[PDB]
Design a protein around this ligand. Structure first.
Ligand SMILES: [Mg+2]
Ligand SMILES: [Mg+2]
Lengths: 252, 244
């Protein structure tokens, strides 16, 4: 099996390195990842710019200031030969759940993979410690794909930050929007300045049975068959009719 | 009358948001909640479990320190504007948000965060850096249009305004998002040191703007399919638990 492995956290990240080592047990892996951490950066293709690459002794390739999508696009069309069987993104440091999948770099890489024509998977750890757990989950998932090739959608995977033995299973999920347990909690700093803290005062619950949120709350691996489509083709007529009805733009 | 949460991507100081704010305060109740800095080229995720500091300006505008556009809208909608906003408006952005650019756009991200409100959210971008007055006039017309006849929610309108005087705007068209990406390729290049450097429709938003029309694209969040949910679940139960 041939894997194009990228991430959002960059080539030296523990998530991608833990995943790369576990995958090389059964698969041939090409890493093409950003040269540095990209979590805070936009995830679009860098158009009309000459991107420099760096090749390490182990074969990993770093794209200088490349986004996750740059890495997949350059990997597919220039850097990886022979071409990959599947594009993998992760393991991300932190969850990619609900509305955040629209904005996630980890997700964006997998999406670019699918747009280019390859099966694609994105993996995220809901925490900071148990990358081994997330690695084991990804390997088991990729085993299944080798045995039974699969949808023109990506698989968005979220893993609880727990030892592997405590993960209560794997669920096929839909995406939530924002978590009902998250709240705006007012805070003050030592200087008396106003601060706001977004999240749960206690445990995260009431998320909804089949959401990606709930699955992770209940200690389950969340798997979402995902395709970020923002278009609203059915709404075109209703907006047209509304503009004529109220006469918007007809008063200039 | 209307309660408008106004945010953007360019930050609280941007000429686009400042022009728009002034215009909207003529007929509406406006609260600015915007990033403390320009966020173009930054990611748009929600900042969870990390305290966000706010600055309040003399005029009542609120800046969120290291706040993403979604942080601003989330905070505005749920804490900073009371009673709750009827609508989120995001812009006026300096530069277009057309076609392939909309997914990663901070301007559109802010609107998307405000999509569950009483009115659909507006993301407004000027196709340039000059005629902010035009884009503000367009936004005002849209808002009044929603007052007279409310349009349904869970949705946003992505609005791109041509960088022209208002008298030169040819009209307003409902469009779809274009895509120039299925035409891109990779052309290698030679550095002076030697190393290789790699280089990457009539109803489209691009076309409307190019022809001097304001582009209005309805957007909706669609992520999953019920048939995909079934085909993955049966694919999972093919290879289950075990102890092997
Ligand atoms: Mg990251
Ligand atoms: Mg901007």
């Amino acid at each position: 099996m041939r894997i194009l492995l990228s991430n959002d956290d960059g080539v030296h990240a523990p998530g991608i390195q833990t995943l790369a080592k576990a995958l090389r047990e059964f698969a041939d892996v090409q890493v093409v990842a950003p040269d540095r951490n990209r979590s805070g950066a936009s995830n679009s293709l860098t158009l009309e710019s000459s991107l420099r690459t760096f090749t390490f002794d182990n074969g990993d390739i770093a794209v200088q200031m490349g986004t996750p999508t740059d890495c997949v696009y350059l990997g597919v069309n220039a850097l990886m030969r022979p071409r990959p069987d599947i594009v993998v993104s992760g393991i991300n440091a932190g969850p990619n759940l609900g509305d955040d999948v629209i904005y996630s770099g980890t997700v964006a890489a997998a999406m670019e993979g699918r747009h280019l024509g390859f099966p694609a998977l994105a993996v995220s750890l809901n925490g900071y410690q148990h990358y081994d757990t997330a690695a084991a989950v990804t390997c088991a998932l990729l085993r299944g794909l080798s045995r039974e090739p699969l949808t023109g959608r990506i698989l968005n995977v979220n893993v609880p930050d727990l030892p592997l033995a405590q993960v209560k299973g794997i669920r096929v999920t839909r995406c939530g929007s924002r978590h009902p347990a998250d709240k705006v909690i007012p805070q003050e700093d030592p200087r008396g300045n106003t601060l706001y803290w977004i999240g749960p005062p206690g445990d995260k619950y009431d998320a909804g049975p089949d959401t990606d949120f709930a699955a992770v709350d209940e200690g389950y691996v969340s798997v979402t068959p995902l395709h970020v489509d923002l278009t609203a083709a059915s709404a075109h007529d209703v907006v047209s009719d509304w503009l004529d009805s109220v006469g918007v733009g007809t008063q200039w």
